[PDB]
Design a protein around this ligand. Structure first.
Ligand SMILES: Nc1ncnc2c1ncn2[C@@H]1O[C@H](COP(=O)(O)OP(=O)(O)OP(=O)(O)O)[C@@H](O)[C@H]1O
Ligand SMILES: Nc1ncnc2c1ncn2[C@@H]1O[C@H](COP(=O)(O)OP(=O)(O)O)[C@@H](O)[C@H]1O
Ligand SMILES: Nc1ncnc2c1ncn2[C@@H]1O[C@H](COP(=O)(O)OP(=O)(O)O)[C@@H](O)[C@H]1O
Ligand SMILES: [Mg+2]
Ligand SMILES: [Mg+2]
Ligand SMILES: [Mg+2]
Lengths: 79, 54, 188, 512, 470, 347
């Protein structure tokens, strides 16, 4: 294969460390990549397709791609 | 000079100059015999041509 | 050493090895994991069944986990155990060997000892070799090194030293070519 | 200088020869295929830097990736093997420049393939350099005489501008460039430096047999003493075809920056784009429309924008470019042709229909255009060119009516006849460039309406006969038109008198 | 202190690895150790503290591991009168060689467009002196203006004439941002503005700024220099409620540069090889070019139509943003008419009986019907001839040819090509001239006299003079 | 010694894993344990001691791990007068059932083209007897000739006429190489040659060699048989020095073959599916078909125009290499004109 966007170094490092702390993975997400107004978010499970999400700044986004390891969100504002 | 007939000093001189270059960061052929050897032949020819304007 | 691997690469094995290097070097240990990864490499090539097991992909996750435990649950640093669990979960177990190799590479880069190779046409007399060691020492003068020799060139009377990733040419062949080229361009 | 004194200087020069060697980082090749080498390590290597393999062939480091480095082999990659060594030279690609280049044939890198002898030069210039700014340049106001009547009159080319010779295969694209080179020969023989124009011919993706015939033609006319030929043939690797135009342009910048004038002729740039597409696709770069890389336009623009007319503060040098573009079926709507047209100033369109109807050079005046316009032409030229253009447009309009209507009015018949004589006059043989002053006389005889008398089939021979008559009997008139560059009233009257007289004397078919 | 370092270099796209506190998107990064100032514009966060950026200068000479500094703000350029009469780069460097630029402050080239409530649209005729434009496609002071043209139809010459006719004798300042065009044209325009005294070396004068991102510049520079010119104008507008004239030489080059790097950035190609973000990238720029409560901006932008295909995505999307549109036709050039303004295709939002005089609207529609009817007849004229037509159709053909030739106007900037001095036509004279032609005022005189003339009276005098000459 | 083992098989592309001492690119490898010996020319070094190669014969029947032997030299074919009157394969095997070929030496089919210094004009007209050709586009002996045509317009018939008119009366040797053509035509030409006395079983006669990589052959074979035939001609040109006549039944197939394998080699496709290396590969083959100071090679190459689209990359790139061109038009065939030569497009 090539790679998986869910295999980020930071997320992988936590597994290697052995500390099972996800800071409430459900209903909370951490941005992994941002480009062209699309943000991929690791975690944030229990999020319905087509649901609105709030970013740290205040701008909203729409969860359009629910993938195995991440969520592809379209930001409703300036990237 | 690449041939035999007094090529031993060339390899010996190269080894000495090569060890110097290795001992140093860079390599300069300050002691290589090729340049003096070529100059000797050329100086002989130059001396030969330098006779007089006539 | 700043919890930073020597190099950063986006390849699969590179990514995992870098995280392992960082995490390992973070807590306290790198040499312990080095033995673990070195053990896997030797085993991957010596034990036929182990190689077939790793490459086998029709195997279930639970089955992979049980076989790994049977190998050994101790004598492997916790980072190594956590790494195997992650690989099983991410179906990346097949790439476990490469990771190992890659890791040791980084480790061998942290190793200060280096091997220097000298290429000369003429056979190097023992007395001459001792002088060469003195020159290499005076050049470095601060790092111990192991010397290697090799004599099958077309150059003559020339020395070429390879040190890991650096090349220094003192060959007389270069001098010959340089002179024949510059004499041509005299533009009299 | 005495021979002995010269020999002493030569010996001393040989004495002062320096040669230093420094620790050069080396890497290994992870893989090699189709001329692309993936290299491991070799860090602290600059983008575009040259690297050397074991055999001695060079490579250009284009892709710098976190894992490896993508190198393009500048030659045949059969000897390259996995695990081989790659040594970084530490210098961006460059080529030898100077005057000794003239009269030689090189490859993209600059190595001479003539077999005459090694290149005796000391100057090496970087191939890719930032183009001149807005201030250094200057308005284009000097003519670059191609020797083609249709071009020098309708599509004037000024020194420092960029004209695009665009057409289909076998329409006479290369012929125009060769004729231009020949015309320059007269200036070099005569000691007029202000008109000398060094000609550079870059052959991209051409059979070596064709270039050899071309060099023989140049030698035959002795026009090779001031010409430089850069060859990147079809067998050569794609990177060579990609760098040859840039290498040639740098050679031209030498003359440009040194107050001289240079003409660089890029053979088909479509072939350079194909090589760049190949070299990029093999590098795993995402392709664009027609598989060309996204930045093909930048390739050609960065190349052609180099040509400029430097200001007098820097020497007043100039580099004039004549890029060639080959079209498939006369569709200038293609991708690469479209880009180049937008880049250059004007374009010379060559049509196949015109070529076989006897119109050779097959130039479509309706489409051809030059931004510089009459600013480049000489005084004696502009006057005649305006009326000539007006006459050509009228002739084209009435051609269709005559065929079907089959009725011609006295006024229309005269305009129809006049246009036909001019079209016959604009015809020109191959390898027969004409002096600018002689063009004025011939074009003068045409626009004034004198040619309407003799039959069309005799117009071409009258040209030859009348030009010889002028060169022999009326030589002061030609000298005035040449030196002054203007057609005075006295010359107008003198010329207007001898033209009809000669037509009546010589043996021609006078019935219109 | 440089936290980042170069990790990957491909073409103009550069990836950087950061240790901590990644820069926001669109920020400007400075590479250290380069012979020339090299700036990188952040475009994407790839994760693992990596950012993918586009270089403004050539990446040749870069090296993996080279330190990179984060400025903490997007590309900021000097604004104010200090830029007046001075050529500036995409990143604000002075390329005129006259010294550093004095600026009250530096503004970033990226900003959010003005709100809807502060749009403040207004319609006011703009007399360009060009009769065809003033008649068929009137320009609006404070509204966008587009010149759609193919290769070599005369949109560059038209921009020069608008400058000569409008830029001068304009109370406010003017900006000229030339993106993607050739450098030779840039030198000509600079010298022309100097001769025309629009710009001078003497300070306190030279009411015009110049920005150039010409071809020689790599992608990313041609894609952001347009924003640089626009930022200068926004300062002149907001901080001073002064009318601003923004001349954008071809803007198609803006989208072209973006697509040149879209692929390397990871985006999938669109229909015709353009980036997926064509519309939004372009709209972000157009919405900023607008009149607001504080000041007004009159933008004249040239759109290059590749291969004369008006359906290309770039110009097709631009059409929606423009208030006035001027479509140059190549067929007219073959006929010799200049300017080659297609009278039928050209449209203007101001072509309304309420905005402009009803007589103006009536005259324009009559011309369009006349020309369209003539174009319809051409087909049968080919087969049967003008003779077999009726008197009504003959009069239509005759009057249309005269009107089409009368639309041609010689401008000052075009003298060198034609050799006839330029001419300026007022609005009243223009409407009356065409109104008279419709009534048959000139159906007597030859159509040749209605060529490269300014007003109808001038054309009639020339016709009478030629008669007395013969 | 069989140091290599088949790693993966994909159609005509085979990967081989080696223990050490990887062969140079273009070298020939022989697979072991397979009837109808199979040769593989190295094409890429993939890394980790793996090399990707192209197969000359059918790969059906290969098993992963199967051994492979390194010959250490590129495909070497026999050359000399022994090839005269004999039918050869892409790898030099005789397919005429006449016995082993007697050749002085074996030349590699991969060679660099002649330099710029070794080139000859040789502008002497070659009278074919065809009025349209001799008139509009006269062939020049010692120069490259190209017949462009679509499906069934008269390319093969025209080749036979040239052989009848030119080859028979010719003085020097001749070489006919068929690339991806119908095998029936090969049989017909061989027997027609025997009948015309141009070739015979008797030794010392048969001033003509034959090479065939016909359609039935798989890719890699149709891609290198042209090089094999070209090499037989280069020997006669350089060593013998005499004039040579090189006929090439459609060369487009060569290009086509490479395309069919390019995708498998991991290359990104070009405009309409062709390989990105089309021009370079074609040029490497074409630059060798040229006259030099040693001897002249008059080459007649038939080019197949797919779907009558002269704008196709293959024929378009081929145009540049040819001295004389003869473009066949299908409209003329409908009118009944034969040969259907387009006088306006034949330069
Ligand atoms: N002025 C001319 N008068 C008569 N014949 C001409 C003239 N110019 C060209 N020809 C003929 O045109 C042919 C070659 O045209 P030329 O090679 O110059 O154009 P080209 O575009 O470079 O063709 P190609 O695409 O094959 O390179 C020759 O047959 C030549 O005789
Ligand atoms: N008013 C005009 N009158 C006569 N010729 C013109 C006129 N305008 C343009 N031409 C010609 O059009 C060409 C310029 O087209 P241009 O405005 O530069 O379009 P572009 O910017 O796309 O290149 C020049 O050859 C110029 O001589
Ligand atoms: N000189 C000719 N005279 C009459 N018919 C011809 C002639 N040449 C070809 N034909 C026709 O052309 C057809 C195909 O010829 P051929 O050269 O084999 O086409 P292809 O290029 O597909 O191999 C023949 O079947 C024959 O019927
Ligand atoms: Mg040509
Ligand atoms: Mg323009
Ligand atoms: Mg056939």
């Amino acid at each position: 294969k090539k790679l998986s966007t869910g295999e980020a170094s930071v997320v992988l490092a936590e597994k290697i460390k052995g500390i099972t702390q996800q800071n409430d993975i459900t209903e909370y997400g951490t941005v992994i990549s941002i480009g062209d107004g699309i943000a991929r978010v690791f975690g944030l499970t229990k999020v319905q397709a087509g649901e609105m999400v709030e970013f740290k700044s205040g701008i909203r986004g729409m969860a359009l791609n629910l993938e195995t390891d991440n969520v592809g969100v379209v930001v409703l504002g300036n990237d | 000079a690449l041939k035999g007939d007094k090529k031993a000093e060339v390899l010996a001189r190269s080894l000495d100059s090569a060890i110097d270059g290795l001992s140093k960061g860079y390599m300069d052929y300050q002691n290589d015999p090729l340049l003096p050897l070529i100059l000797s032949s050329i100086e002989a020819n130059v001396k030969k041509i330098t006779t007089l304007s006539a | 050493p700043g919890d930073k691997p020597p190099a950063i690469e986006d390849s699969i094995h590179g990514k995992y090895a870098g995280v392992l290097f960082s995490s390992a070097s973070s807590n306290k240990s790198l040499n312990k994991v080095a033995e673990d990864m070195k053990y896997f490499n030797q085993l991957y090539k010596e034990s036929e069944v182990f190689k077939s097991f790793l490459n086998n992909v029709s195997l279930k996750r639970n089955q992979q986990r049980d076989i790994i435990s049977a190998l050994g649950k101790t004598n492997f640093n916790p980072a190594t155990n956590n790494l195997l669990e992650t690989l099983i979960e991410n179906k990346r177990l097949d790439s476990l060997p490469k990771i190992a190799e890659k890791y040791m590479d980084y480790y061998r880069i942290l190793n200060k000892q280096e091997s220097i190779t000298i290429i000369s046409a003429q056979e190097l007399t023992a007395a001459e070799k001792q002088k060469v060691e003195q020159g290499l020492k005076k050049g470095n003068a601060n790092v111990q090194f192991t010397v290697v020799y090799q004599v099958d060139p077309a150059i003559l009377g020339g020395l070429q030293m390879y040190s890991g990733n650096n090349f220094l040419d003192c060959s007389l062949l270069s001098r010959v070519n340089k002179l024949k080229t510059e004499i041509a361009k005299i533009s009299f | 200088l005495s021979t002995g004194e010269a020999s002493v200087v030569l010996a001393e020069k040989i004495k002062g020869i320096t040669q230093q060697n420094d620790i050069t980082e080396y890497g290994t090749v992870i893989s090699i295929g189709d001329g692309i080498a993936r290299v491991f390590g070799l860090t602290k290597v600059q983008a575009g830097e040259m690297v050397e393999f074991k055999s001695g062939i060079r490579g250009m480091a284009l892709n710098l990736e976190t894992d490896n480095v993508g190198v393009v082999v500048l030659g045949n990659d059969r000897d390259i093997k996995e695990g081989d060594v790659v040594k970084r030279t530490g210098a961006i690609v460059d080529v030898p420049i100077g005057e000794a280049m003239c009269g030689r044939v090189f490859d993209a890198l600059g190595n001479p393939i003539d077999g005459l002898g090694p290149l005796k030069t000391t100057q090496r210039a970087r191939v890719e350099i930032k183009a001149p700014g807005i201030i250094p340049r200057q308005s284009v106001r000097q003519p670059m005489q191609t020797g083609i009547k249709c071009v020098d009159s309708l599509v004037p080319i000024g020194r420092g501008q960029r004209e695009l010779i665009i057409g289909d295969r076998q329409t006479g694209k290369t012929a125009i460039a060769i004729d231009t080179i020949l015309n320059q020969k007269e200036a070099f023989n005569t000691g007029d430096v202000k008109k000398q124009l060094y000609c550079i011919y870059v052959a991209v993706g051409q059979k070596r047999s064709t270039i050899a015939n071309l060099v023989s033609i140049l030698k035959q006319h002795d026009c090779m003493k001031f010409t430089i030929v850069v060859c990147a043939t079809a067998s050569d690797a794609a990177p060579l075809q990609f760098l040859a135009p840039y290498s040639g342009c740098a050679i031209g910048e030498f003359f440009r920056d040194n107050g001289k004038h240079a003409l660089i002729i890029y053979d088909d740039l479509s072939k350079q784009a194909v090589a760049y597409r190949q070299m990029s696709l093999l590098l795993r770069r995402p392709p664009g429309r027609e598989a060309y890389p996204g930045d093909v336009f930048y390739l050609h623009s960065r190349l052609l924008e180099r040509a400029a007319k430097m200001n007098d503060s820097l020497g007043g040098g100039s580099l004039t470019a004549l890029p060639v573009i080959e079209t498939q079926a006369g569709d200038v709507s293609a991708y690469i042709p479209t880009n180049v047209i937008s880049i250059t100033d004007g374009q010379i369109f060559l049509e196949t229909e015109l070529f076989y109807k006897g119109i050779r050079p097959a130039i479509n005046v309706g489409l051809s255009v030059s931004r510089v316009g009459s600013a480049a032409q000489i005084k004696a030229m502009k006057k005649i060119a305006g009326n000539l253009k007006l006459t050509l447009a009228t002739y084209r309009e009435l051609a269709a009516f005559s065929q079907f209507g089959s009725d011609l009015d006295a006024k229309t018949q005269q305009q129809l006849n006049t246009g036909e004589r001019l079209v016959e006059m604009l015809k020109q043989n191959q390898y027969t460039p004409m002096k600018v002053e002689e063009q004025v006389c011939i074009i003068f005889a045409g626009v004034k309406g004198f040619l309407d008398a003799l039959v069309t089939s005799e117009v071409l021979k009258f040209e030859k006969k009348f030009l010889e008559h002028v060169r022999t009997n009326h030589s002061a008139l030609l000298k005035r038109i040449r030196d002054s560059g203007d057609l005075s009233e006295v010359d107008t009257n003198e010329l207007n008198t001898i033209i009809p007289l000669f037509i009546q004397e010589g043996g021609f078919k006078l019935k219109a | 202190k440089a936290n980042g370092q170069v990790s990957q270099v491909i073409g103009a796209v550069v990836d950087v690895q950061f240790e901590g506190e990644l820069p926001q998107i669109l920020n400007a990064l400075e590479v250290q150790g380069t012979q020339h100032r090299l700036v990188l514009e952040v475009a994407q966060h790839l994760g693992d503290s990596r950012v993918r950026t586009i270089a403004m200068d050539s990446t040749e000479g870069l090296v993996r591991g080279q330190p990179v500094v984060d400025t903490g703000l997007p590309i900021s350029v000097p604004v104010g009168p200090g830029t007046l009469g001075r050529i500036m780069n995409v990143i604000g460097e002075p390329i005129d060689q006259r010294g550093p630029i004095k600026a009250a402050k530096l503004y970033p080239i990226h900003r959010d467009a003005p709100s809807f409530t502060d749009q403040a649209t207004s319609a006011e005729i703009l007399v360009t002196g060009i009769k065809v434009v003033d008649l068929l496609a009137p320009y609006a002071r404070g509204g966008k203006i587009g010149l759609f043209g193919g290769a070599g139809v005369g949109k560059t010459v038209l921009i020069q004439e608008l400058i000569n006719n409008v830029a001068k004798h304009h109370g406010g300042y003017s900006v000229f941002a030339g993106v993607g065009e050739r450098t030779r044209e840039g030198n000509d325009l600079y010298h022309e503005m100097m001769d025309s005294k629009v710009i001078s070396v003497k300070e306190g004068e030279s009411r015009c700024a110049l920005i150039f991102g010409q071809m020689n510049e790599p992608p990313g520079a041609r894609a952001r220099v347009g924003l640089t010119g626009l930022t200068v104008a926004e300062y002149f507008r907001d901080e001073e409620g002064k009318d601003v004239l923004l001349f954008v030489d071809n803007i198609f080059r803006f989208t072209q540069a973006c697509s040149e790097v879209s692929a390397l950035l990871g985006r999938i190609p669109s229909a015709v090889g353009y980036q997926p973000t064509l519309a939004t990238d372009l709209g972000a720029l157009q919405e900023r070019i607008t009149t607001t409560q504080k000041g007004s901006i009159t933008s004249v932008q040239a759109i290059y139509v590749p291969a004369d295909d008006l359906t290309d995505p770039a110009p097709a999307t631009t059409f929606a943003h423009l208030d006035a549109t001027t479509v140059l036709n190549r067929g007219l050039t073959e006929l010799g008419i200049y300017p080659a303004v297609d009278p039928l295709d050209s449209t203007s939002r101001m072509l309304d009986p309420i905005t402009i005089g009803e007589e103006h609207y009536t005259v324009a529609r009559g011309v369009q019907k006349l020309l369209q009817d003539y174009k319809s007849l051409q087909d049968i004229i080919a087969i049967l001839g003008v003779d077999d037509l009726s008197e009504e159709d003959k009069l239509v053909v005759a009057r249309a040819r005269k009107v089409q030739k009368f639309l041609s106007q010689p401008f000052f900037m075009s003298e060198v090509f034609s050799g006839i001095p330029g001419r300026f036509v007022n609005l009243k004279q223009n409407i009356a001239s065409f109104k008279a032609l419709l009534e048959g005022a000139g159906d007597e005189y030859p159509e040749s006299c209605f060529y490269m003339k300014g007003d109808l009276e001038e054309s009639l005098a020339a016709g009478r003079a030629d008669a007395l000459k013969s």
